[model samples]
Target chain A: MSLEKAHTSVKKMTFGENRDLERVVTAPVSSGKIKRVNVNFDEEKHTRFKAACARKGTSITDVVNQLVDNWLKENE
Target chain B: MSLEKAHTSVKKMTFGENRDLERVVTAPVSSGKIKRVNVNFDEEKHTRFKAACARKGTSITDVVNQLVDNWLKENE
Candidate 1:
């Protein structure tokens, strides 16, 4: 309904022992400033996704998003 | 199993038109601290998750994790 005001971030997401990890791989994400970029993994990344997801019965999307989130938090 | 050592941030998550949204309601998430807090959809957030997921062909887990990430990014 409303326009994207600013970039927001969620916190306290599990990224395992990866220090560089934030909520990076634990969520789905879309950007407003840019086009809607949905990053889902295929078989290649599925191993990583599944392993992590199964560890907590989580979804693949969240794990991947959390990875992306980690990157963003660091870059910005 | 290993313990969570640090926090990470992911980049380029689609948060729809909501700018404050990085990755809010598109993925599954679990916190490692004080036990893993898995935040997924049940009812109320389903509408929001579905609306977004269908448009993006993503899982409900991603939608939710992104939401949490968005909130986390803002606070911390």
Candidate 2:
């Protein structure tokens, strides 16, 4: 088999359980840059937000990422 | 009840099931600022990294946060 075939076979073996991650990882944008965002909230509201985040098993970063993606898609 | 007592009681009622989130939410630093970070990795390595993240049920951001926290504690 060609070297390329060997590489593909290896990736399949190792990443079989997470093909989605494999696809994203191979994307050009996978590991390059990140942007920061900040927000303000009163103590009470912030507390509720954090609690909601914990209960949902997600982080603020994930929420922000979702929001931004949605916003962009809506505009586009 | 005093206003302070009322607030405490309300929080207890609302945040009963997730007290840990309540503690952090009330912290002075809850909703303030965020910093961006960038990283680069080969596609194969990144694929493995993302698969590992999925298996652990965490994000790359959380991993970076942990590494930074540990590094700071070590230095301090």
Candidate 3:
């Protein structure tokens, strides 16, 4: 399982070369079918967690899925 | 608590009138301080849930938070 950063839409006044007119942050690669779930987190914790993930080259998805997987196996 | 669909980046070929050149899906209203959390869900379940929310005019965030709150209050 792999986790990839989701893309964000941003507008750029100009494109230097061979790029789309508009800017999409990160420009994540396409993947197979997936589902999205949204949850609420503490604002500061979220920021720091994201920064840590970026620095560690870990995908947030991977970490979260691992947490859920552990939860599922806990009772068994 | 309200959950508005997040804006998605989509490029439009043309703008009809005074609209922006590129399209940002949903165009959600500005909100105050908030945090984002990502969870993994079954693809079909996620789709059905979002569609149900749309029909019921309920925000996903509100519903999820309620579920979480109930969990917190459980066994107390």
Candidate 4:
């Protein structure tokens, strides 16, 4: 019937269980810093594209973002 | 000393094990019908983007490819 009684039972959960409760609070992806976008592709193109990408030190994520930015300017 | 001996040992692989060999052959993707382009995103931008895209009867992939095609026209 009291707040203290409600807390007493659930407080038995240890730090390990507490950590498992929810992880989104402080994570970068959950906090609007990064978003994942998986897209479909042809295997042949993907294979060839990777080799071209592998040739870059700029990384795949950056290349995609760069291409998208350029594409968007022309688009909109 | 014979062609029979060469295939005899390897030919023991049955259909199940043969399927495990390699999947690239005969698959539509392997035949060059599609290509995948996984890209990076900003969470806030992508979050809002999806909502707007959901309002469309057209799918995300089609919209994306449509955008890309238009962009390339202007770009190239």
**Top model by DockQ, which number?**
4
Task: Give the clashing pairs for model 2.
Answer: none
Report the number of backbone clashes for model 3.
0
**Candidate 1 vs 4: which has more TM-score:** 4
What is each predicted model's overall lDDT from 0 to 1?
Answer: 0.44, 0.48, 0.50, 0.57
Which 10-residue window of candidate 2 chain B scores lowest in summed lDDT? B67-76
Return the candidate ranking by TM-score, descending. 4, 3, 2, 1
For each prediction in turn, the share of the native Cα contacts (below 8 Å between chains A and B) that it retains comes to 0.00, 0.00, 0.52, 0.57
TM-score of the second chain in each model? 0.40, 0.39, 0.39, 0.48
Candidate 3 wrongly placed segments (more than 4 Å): A1-33, A42-76, B1-34
lDDT by residue (tens digit), candidate 3, B1-76: 1332222212232334446544766565433236677776555545655665576567866655444333223311
Report, for candidate 2, the interface RMSD: 12.9
Cα deviation of A23, candidate 1, in Å: 36
Docking class of 2: incorrect
TM-score of each: 0.25, 0.26, 0.30, 0.41
Across residues A1-76, which tens digit of lDDT does each residue of candidate 1 receive? 1322232212424344456657666545332322233433334234444665677675655654454444334423
State candidate 4's TM-score: 0.41
Error at A40, model 3, angstroms: 2.3
Which prediction has more favorable DockQ, 2 or 4?
A: 4
Individual DockQ of the candidates?
0.01, 0.02, 0.20, 0.28
